[PDB]
Amino acid sequence: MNIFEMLRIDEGLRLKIYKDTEGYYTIGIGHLLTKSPSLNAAKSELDKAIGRNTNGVITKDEAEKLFNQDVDAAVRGILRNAKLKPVYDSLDAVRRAAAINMVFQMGETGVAGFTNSLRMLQQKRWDEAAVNLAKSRWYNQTPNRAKRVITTFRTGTWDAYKNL
Numbered sequence: 155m156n157i158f159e160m161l162r163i164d165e166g167l168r169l170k171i172y173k174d175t176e177g178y179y180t181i182g183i184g185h186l187l188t189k190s191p192s193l194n195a196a197k198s199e200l201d202k203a204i205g206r207n208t209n210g211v212i213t214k215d216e217a218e219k220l221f222n223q224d225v226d227a228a229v230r231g232i233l234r235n236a237k238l239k240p241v242y243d244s245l246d247a248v249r250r251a252a253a254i255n256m257v258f259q260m261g262e263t264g265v266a267g268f269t270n271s272l273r274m275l276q277q278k279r280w281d282e283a284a285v286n287l288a289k290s291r292w293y294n295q296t297p298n299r300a301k302r303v304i305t306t307f308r309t310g311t312w313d314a315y316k317n318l
């Protein structure tokens with residue numbers, strides 16, 4: 155298991171434009187295109203992302219290319235953020251994956267707002283951090299995925315992803 159396999163499990167893979175859990179146009183492995191309700195606007199973003207005039211449809215190779223870029227962007231966002239970087243630096247590689255997962259799903263700004271959870275993670279108060287993380291719109295809206303990510307933070311193991 156690793157961050158790529160982890161996010162592949164959590165996001166799935168779809169080669170045609172679809173709507174994510176919030177109703178936003180998305181493609182591939184959870185690549186958000188736009189928050190606009192316009193499918194045309196989504197298609198425009200897709201073509202710009204891929205570098206060709208698509209039919210709202212991409213190849214697996216293209217989906218994986220975007221995915222790698224998005225994983226990179228998440229790590230980049232963490233390392234450039236004053237609130238996220240020290241917590242990330244403080245973590246083991248398994249828990250680092252959980253942090254990347256959250257940033258991939260909700261963005262750097264959203265994750266940086268988990269101030270109290272972040273503090274508990276940096277203190278390595280795993281059970282307390284887990285309890286705090288679950289007190290969120292995030293957990294309520296995507297509880298099964300959030301449970302997996304929280305279990306990863308709680309245990310520093312891949313146990314939540316091993317049956318998957």
Ligand SMILES: [Cl-]
Pocket residue numbers: 298299
């Ligand atoms: Cl599930």
